[PDB]
Amino acid sequence: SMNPPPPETSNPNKPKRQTNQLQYLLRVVLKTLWKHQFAWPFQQPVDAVKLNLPDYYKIIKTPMDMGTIKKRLENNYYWNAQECIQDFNTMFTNCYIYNKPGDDIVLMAEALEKLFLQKINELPTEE
Ligand SMILES: COc1cc(Nc2ncc(F)c(Nc3ccc4c(n3)N(COP(=O)(O)O)C(=O)C(C)(C)O4)n2)cc(OC)c1OC
């Protein structure tokens, strides 16, 4: 049993730029979620080998995690905020698909998502 390669966090062929929205996503949104007490299961790719979840990457074919998102932001991998927002949504959705509703990990994800949505409502206008 093996893990897939993690999602890419840089690509020399993918155009990049900075925007105040992407800055906010790193400095406020990611930062808030990253330091939250429920962040830890989401701070790196799911290690299915270690967790003995041999079915994880059979069920989840679009993995995503905040470690990857953090590196993507730091590496200026994204062109726009919606790409980053999509990654957070993929991360939450994977949890809700793989785990049973009501499991603690689902409650942790829901708490993080609630907080995420609050911060996204406060996204600044593009400069
Ligand atoms: C409920 O299923 C999920 C569980 C998690 N849990 C989850 N997410 C992230 C973790 F870091 C983590 N730590 C963890 C959890 C269980 C563990 C171990 N570590 N280690 C320690 O590894 P290290 O030696 O310290 O490196 C082990 O050695 C064994 C004994 C194999 O059991 N668990 C995380 C999930 O999604 C993000 C899950 O949904 C897929």
**Structural domains for the chain:** 19-123 (1.20.920.10)
Q: Which of 1, 3, 46, 50 to mutate to test the pocket of ligand 1 (most atoms within 8 A of CB)?
A: 50
Rounded distance, CA 84 to CA 124, Å? Answer: 15
Pocket of ligand 1 from Cβ distances under 6 Å: 41-42, 46, 50-51, 53, 56, 95, 98-99, 105
- Is 117 in contact with 111 (CB distance < 8 Å)? no
CA angle 86, 89, 93 (to 5 degrees): 135
Amino acid at 89: N
Q: How was this structure determined?
A: X-ray
Rounded distance, CA 20 to CA 59, Å? Answer: 36
- Is 3 in contact with 53 (CB distance < 8 Å)? no
